[PDB]
Amino acid sequence: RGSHMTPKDDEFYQQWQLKYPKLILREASSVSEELHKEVQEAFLTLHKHGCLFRDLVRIQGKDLLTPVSRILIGNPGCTYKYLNTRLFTVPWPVKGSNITEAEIAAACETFLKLNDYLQIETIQALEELAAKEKANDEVDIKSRAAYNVTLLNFMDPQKMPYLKEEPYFGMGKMAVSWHHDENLVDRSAVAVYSYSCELEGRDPDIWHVGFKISWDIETPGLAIPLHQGDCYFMLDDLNATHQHCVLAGSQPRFSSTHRVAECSTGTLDYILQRCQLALQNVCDDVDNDDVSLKSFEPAVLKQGEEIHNEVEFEWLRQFWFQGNRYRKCTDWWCQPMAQLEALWKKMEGVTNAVLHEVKREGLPVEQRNEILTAILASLTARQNLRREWHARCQSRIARTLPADQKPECRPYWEKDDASMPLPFDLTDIVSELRGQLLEA
């Protein structure tokens, strides 16, 4: 049978060294009492103000509410995407940032302080790691520790008892199943501060993090006990070569999971830049509904429609699916999402202008068909993704969420809405374009 090891097992320490060396543990003792106090009060503050929410994610095609409640804190404008869900940062006061309620703002400051400390600890550990490997660059080390977000977790096993059994090693109840972390910079470290409020194998009353080798249930897994204020670090390629899970104890527990999000297509600045690139193809003297395009070159049109999808689905639908929970903690994304929606709306104008050109009496058919081939893939994806998002918004599990967390299918409009140049449902349009492309 599959098995696991804990500190109670004589082989635990040599197995940790042999098969899990890029896992590091810094016990609560190594962290100042002052910092423990601040961070723990910050967790409690965010809980009290109701800032942590179960996420309605998607896994193997199913809509699932995570047992764990979460909140993303981090650099202004940054996002972190996991399980098909793009989380938007509640901003921490990074330098040269401007300005959201007193206690919440203090809490985010605290997690930035914690971020600074864990970053220092991580750099030190990566230096020690390389030196160990020397017995056989500094910019890389710095970048692999440059945490830009933390994903905070909370779970009360007494209130959230509906937990699955760990299936391979007898590790008991899981708060989070076996996984690799998503959307991390390659070989970037993860630092976790773990805060638990107050036999054969691992103690069921105590929280652990479990590790196993990928693809491998023969090598016994490790279960690392996590007491109040213990920290652990996944270094270098550990996240790739191994999987981990979180094993529930009996008491409520928070954690702060500091990460280097791979946010190359995942910041507000990046997506604003994309929108601006798309709108370079629009005559921009005045903001009205008489949208006219500078070029119908296929490459340019394809690009514009791709950007249209990107802002629609990766930004707007993601944001509003989450029911503006952020707004409880911060108004930071309010103006940005209004601006992103206006940019998108102009892009609906653009699509209409391309459709109008395609129908233009004097357009030679060869040019028309070139345009159709340029845009069809994007419009097809737009239709399919609109169906998916609309259903994801209307799913049974979605409809049970409280009113302050209810998914909002947005943008959405009825065919009777004269403010929108095109219908929400593109079935007919896509069908017609396809048929045109096949005309003899």
Which of the choices ligand MD6, Zn ion, none does residue 53 contact, using the CB cut-off of 5 to 8 A by kind?
Answer: none
DSSP state of 210: E
Breaks (C-N over 2.5 A) in the chain follow: 99, 136, 198
Q: Is 388 in the site for Zn ion (CB under 5 A)?
A: no
Q: Tell me which long-range contacts 215-219 makes (C-beta under 8 A, separation of at least 24).
A: 217/2, 217/168, 217/169, 218/2, 219/19
**Binding residue for ligand MD6, selected from 23, 118, 209, 354, defined by CB under 6 A:** 209
Whose CA is closest to 378, among 346, 347, 420?
Answer: 347
71 vs 48: CA distance, rounded Å: 13
- Torsion 35-41-47-49 (CA) sign: negative
- Other CB atoms within 10 Å distance of the CB of residue 239: 22
Q: For ligand MD6, give the closer residue by CB, 46 or 151.
A: 151
Interhelix angle 334-359/298-309, rounded to 10 degrees, is 140
Tell whether 181 is in a known binding site: yes
Among 141, 171, 191, 192, binds ligand MD6 (CB under 6 A): 192
Number of other residues whose CB lies within 10 A of the CB of residue 139: 7
Which of Zn ion, ligand MD6, none lies near 311, with the C-beta cut-off 5 to 8 A by kind? none
- CA distance linking residue 312 with residue 329, whole number of Å: 24
From ligand MD6, Zn ion, none, interface partner of 194 (C-beta below 5 to 8 A by class): ligand MD6
Q: Which stretch binds Zn ion (CB under 5 A): 5-13, 19-27, 175-183, 408-416?
A: 175-183
Helices 298-309 and 365-394, axial angle in degrees (round to 10): 10
Decide whether 244 or 386 has the Cβ nearer to ligand MD6: 244
257 binds ligand MD6 (CB under 6 A): yes
The pair phi, psi for residue 192, each rounded to 5°, is -125, 125
Binding mask 66-95 for ligand MD6 (x = CB under 6 A): ----------------x-------------
Answer yes or no: is 70 a known binding residue: yes
Applying CB under 6 A, does 243 fall inside the site for ligand MD6?
A: no
Is residue 216 involved in binding ligand MD6 (CB under 6 A)? no
List Cα–Cα distances, 144 to 92, 117, 332, 386, 432, in angstroms.
Answer: 20, 15, 27, 36, 50
Options 115, 255, 281, 322; binder of ligand MD6; rule CB under 6 A: 255
Q: Which listed range, 14-22, 41-49, 100-108, 174-182, lies at the site for Zn ion (CB under 5 A)? A: 174-182
Residue 151 makes contact with ligand MD6 by CB under 6 A: yes
Q: How far is the CB of 228 from ligand MD6 (least distance, A)?
A: 13
CB of 257 to Zn ion, least distance (A): 7
Pick from 115, 119, 194, 267: which binds ligand MD6 (CB under 6 A)?
194
Report residue 364 CA to chain centroid gap.
46
Nearer of residues 234 and 311 to ligand MD6, judged by Cβ: 234
Q: Which option in Zn ion, ligand MD6, none does residue 246 bind, with CB closer than 5 to 8 A by kind?
A: ligand MD6
Q: Amino acid identity, residue 9?
A: D
Name the residue with the smallest CB distance to ligand MD6: 255
List strand residue ranges (DSSP E) for 201-277, in order.
Answer: 208-213, 221-225, 231-234, 242-247, 253-259
Rule CB under 5 A: choose which of 63, 156, 181, 306 binds Zn ion. 181
Residue with tokens 């893939």: 377
Contact with ligand MD6 (CB under 6 A) among 19, 26, 244, 368? 244
- Does 188 bind ligand MD6 (CB under 6 A)? Our answer is no
Binding site for substrate, by residue number, is 70, 82, 179-182
Q: What is the binding site for ligand MD6 (CB under 6 A)?
A: 82, 151, 153, 176, 181, 192, 194, 209, 244, 246, 255, 257
Binding site for Fe cation, by residue number, is 179, 181, 244
